Symmetry: C3
Subunit: 480 residues, 3 copies
């Protein structure tokens, strides 16, 4: 069976609308990729070591894929998924065989589009992945990964990535990032500040996180005023690594505006070990405001990623640990939650906040009204389960009416799967084009406006929001 990957995919069937869409996408398809939020390993580009298997690249590290298979009765051992006891005994060929046999599950899901984009456009496959085709797929991409063109830096250059952001905590060292810039390569690989491990006292890996947060900053992190200094010192070390943004994956969008003493008192109680869910929530809430207060000084762009019920499968958390596809969205609140921070700093020009959600109902109700008013608020793209074609379309249909396009930030891939990056960004460009085309076709915007918009949405608006206009000296110049 052939792999048919149509040049006009994701555009609406209506030929009038499809013709407008294709023209808008034409203006935008070969523009460089700006990836200002993501979870790729910077040690891939630091060492420039090859990837080994198809499984180690596409199957084992991607939770979107092994979720579905786990959901249908397949063990994580059968797919070589990294356990807490280490990498399983399974043959990487046999792990791939199981995936290929279960590839039908992904029909109508965005993984069908992303992987077939990788298969047809990166590897040049001409047949569709099945059980009969499985081994041919395995050894042909294993062989491709051994070649010099499929080295991490070479792929970065081939994919036309202008900016790539990894996410690191304050307790981990930025040694791999230093290696990117002191090598002459010039690929603009940046970091972002995720202090979640030293902010969430209910995190099980928080005691060890605090311990190496002390090493990296050289401060008394168990006393409040030097805990804050430690954040300031580490933030500056991130800005020195090029970072322009901070990221905050809290369970809630809650913020608080405690006095310096009220915060210290709370900090003392939690460090003492008297950790209640109420105190831990309030500290996370106070830290959002505290991080924003530092952003007034150091100029970091603040991303809030709330609403994930992390580690919902308890039995899986014991056996395999974090990020194994069992993080489930919760209903999130913003109007009452963000009010304390917005009372203090909501009209401040020096602050920039980008809001994400796992709860689509808040789009037209809360997010678009808030962001269409507050100078500091901006709207991030549809995230996680919603970075799909239908989720992206719902975003545009529900957000634009009140917020407009200029109160959004564009798109990020938000992935560990490196090869899927051009695939994911392509999908975004086509869906934006489809939305914009429909506005032209229904005479809700002029074509001249639409042609200005995709270039803005794709390229200019991400760059302004993430303060990416100032390229460093160690990076390549920005060219079209």
């Amino acid at each position: 069976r052939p792999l048919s990957f149509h040049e006009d995919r994701l555009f609406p069937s209506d030929p009038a609308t499809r013709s407008y869409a294709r023209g808008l996408y034409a203006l935008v398809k070969d523009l460089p990729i700006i990836s200002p939020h993501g979870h790729t390993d910077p040690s891939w580009f630091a060492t420039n070591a090859p990837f080994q298997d198809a499984t180690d690249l596409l199957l084992a590290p991607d939770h979107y894929l092994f979720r579905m298979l786990y959901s249908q009765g397949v063990s994580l051992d059968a797919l070589k998924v990294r356990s807490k006891a280490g990498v399983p005994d399974t043959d990487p060929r046999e792990a791939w065989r199981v995936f290929a046999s279960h590839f039908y599950l992904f029909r109508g899901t965005p993984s069908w589009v992303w992987l077939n984009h990788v298969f047809s456009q990166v590897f040049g496959f001409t047949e569709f992945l099945e059980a009969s085709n499985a081994d041919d797929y395995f050894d042909r991409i294993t062989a491709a990964l051994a070649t010099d063109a499929f080295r991490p830096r070479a792929l970065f250059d081939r994919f036309n990535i202008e900016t790539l952001a990894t996410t690191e905590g304050p307790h981990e060292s930025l040694q791999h990032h230093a290696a990117i810039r002191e090598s002459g390569w010039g690929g603009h690989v940046i970091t972002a500040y995720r202090p979640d491990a030293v902010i969430d006292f209910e995190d099980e890996r928080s005691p060890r996180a605090f311990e190496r947060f002390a090493e990296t900053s050289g401060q008394d992190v168990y006393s409040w005023k030097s805990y804050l200094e430690a954040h300031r010192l580490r933030r500056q070390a991130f800005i020195d690594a090029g970072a322009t943004s901070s990221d905050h994956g809290h369970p809630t969008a809650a913020t608080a505006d405690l006095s310096d003493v009220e915060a210290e008192a709370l900090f003392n109680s939690l460090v003492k070990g008297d950790v209640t869910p109420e105190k831990a929530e309030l500290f996370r809430a106070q830290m959002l405001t505290e991080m924003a207060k530092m952003s007034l000084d150091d100029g970091l762009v603040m991303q809030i990623h709330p609403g994930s019920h992390r580690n919902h499968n308890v039995g899986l958390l014991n056996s395999h640990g974090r990020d194994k596809g069992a993080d489930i969205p919760m209903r999130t609140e913003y109007v009452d939650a963000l009010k304390p921070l917005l009372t203090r700093l909501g009209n401040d020009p020096r602050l920039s906040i980008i809001l994400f959600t796992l709860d689509e109902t808040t789009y037209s109700r809360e997010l678009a009204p808030l962001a269409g008013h507050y100078p500091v608020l901006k709207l991030g793209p549809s995230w996680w389960f919603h970075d799909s074609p239908e989720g992206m379309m719902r975003f545009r249909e529900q957000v634009t009416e009140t917020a407009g396009f200029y109160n959004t930030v564009g798109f990020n891939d938000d992935t560990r799967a490196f090869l899927s990056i051009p695939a994911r960004h392509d999908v975004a460009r086509r869906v934006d084009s489809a939305f914009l085309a429909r506005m032209v076709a229904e005479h809700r915007m002029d074509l001249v406006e639409a042609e200005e918009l995709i270039v803005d949405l794709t390229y200019n608006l991400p760059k302004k929001a993430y303060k990416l206009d100032q390229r460093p000296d160690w990076a390549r110049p920005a060219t079209l």
Copy 2:
């Protein structure tokens, strides 16, 4: 004015999409109906007595219809709706006359589609229902009901129903199901286990339910371990009557994982008469887990139907009683709610749970993320008010990207109106055809995949999910 019931109804207007839709539907339109959850009376097929009126068959027992009329100033006595004081004194012809004169209300509703299917396909009417057409409709339906071709069993065969499930509690007899099997007629009419009345202590008809639950089981029902034995024995009796499923219509999706002594303690308090809203919730929650623990042994597929505010009209509950169209959906939660059961049994191979909702906002947020991960969880079709062209489409648009298609169970009609069964299944088939057609037209799926999926969704997937693959000897063999 003519009854124009078009061949291309429910397909999108876009001609390229419409023609894919038409092609997929043709592959599926004449497949047998599998109806694994519903509320038809089993006595209809055991006695094979004819229906009497157009009013008694279409108007009086259907709450979808009299709701709208009651909503517009019509009394239920005017429409011959069974009161708590019995069947009203009004003329069935006059009841039909009022409905006919108010049939315009249903413009744009799915009942327009279902009833016009019944009028044009089942009865062969050629004119549209109006006030001046009313009497002609009444006596032509009534005359038709006297014929041998409109006997319940004869209609079951004409409709090409393969499997029909009814819904009984543990306190009622499986009298009519035994009579169906024992007869020469080979219709596969089965049952479903719905223990709601002996589980909800806040149910007003619970003390009488518990009383006859003791008669049907022969057990000490007001003592814990033998209340559980009474459930096991009754479930076995349902299995022997052909049941493959259980059904749970609780106010919430809440589950619990109490110890044996904690469960007995709570049970004893409620049996004593200390029914507090908190304790009644906890028992309904604990019983969800308890039914799943029984399902580990007997293989009953567990359907959860939560989130209905039953009997919202208090005045109507006093005068007429239950199921009179005053049950309003509530905001429903699944993530925290289902966690205690999923921690215990979420990764078990032997357990099969099907989740339904009245809260469409949980599709992309909670249900699909949960069902796209857990081995035990599957998604039921859009239910009740969302069992409709716009509703089924929203389900498919919001659920597919995370759960896929193979984590869904197809379609159930969930109706008492027997004549609307082929009408409702036809709507399911056209909307599914329309959705798949849009995937093909926008090149998000290959035609080959869509042709496979339409047949699976219609026939194979409802069969697998409801364990309908073993026909019993007392029914017909399954042919296309």
Copy 3:
């Protein structure tokens, strides 16, 4: 760059569906405007004084426009927005300049459609608004407002408005309405009862509104039984001014059924000064039921507009005050909330309630199942942030299947911007035509049904629902 305002705007691109839409809209485009809920100033038509600037008419009063600009970093002083310290020192021409340079922000928003309608249809502009175009736009509409064709009364007649309802509290005078109905101009301008200031005790302007509520009624407003009489007497004065409606903008849709004695107990505590959030909520809850009980006698139609977290920007409330575009929607509940009122009066033929929402998730879940059952309940059109093409389409797509079309109430504009009224009503007619066309094209309704429906939805249904069938003798006959 030309101002191209296409004659088939807002209809779907699909040529067959579009052709149906165009035919349904043709049946309805020139019908008179029924505006059963709005916030226009009755003194405009009473005095018939002209409007001054482009800024004072279009930019400064409309919060949809200055929301977007403030959101991008523009000060409200730079846009001549009324502060608490009065009208700013800035030039109206220079305020217009800022808006014109930032008109690109409104791409994809309903403000694009409304304003270009005003620009092309009301004014006759031929070029698109830009920074280089700013000054020409300003003084050409400044000069047009001086002319006799653009006087409030002349525009009312030109726009073919049949009915206009304004919104007044019980503590203010209906002098301007009295001036309307005694002059020879036959424009049907009515009012609507909005008792929010004398019911919400957490309102900062409540103690002052209680004082003038006593003045206009001549009752002991600070004791329960005469407080209720003060409402009844003021409600009669509104009906004298032609009002058919009351409006209730509470934070919650909560209702209550307290006894006469529990209600007085609660009232007495709040008048004492013991205002707690729980007591204030319960009073707002009880007062909804009380207004409903009054509606059984005087026949007023009850509009519930819940869910707005008003004055979310604290610093802006202190500096500029109310209605400055910082009123954010909250999640709203209707099922448990409306139950105490519906247990008492849910089946009563004399009662009419119209339900609004700011929370689109309640449409298919709560609002349509409630309205598709209870004899008293009806659904108002998509409100505020949702009175827009995608919002109205989501409304129709989520409400119709359970509630039907006859449990809805048509459209209202809900606006201060008087020139935007025909624009907003046109959008409503185009989207309704679009939705009905899609039903016909998918053969879910017949064309005969759709042809009846847009005329009902546009004209007949709003009139029946707001009891606008009996024209008073001071107003022009409807034609």
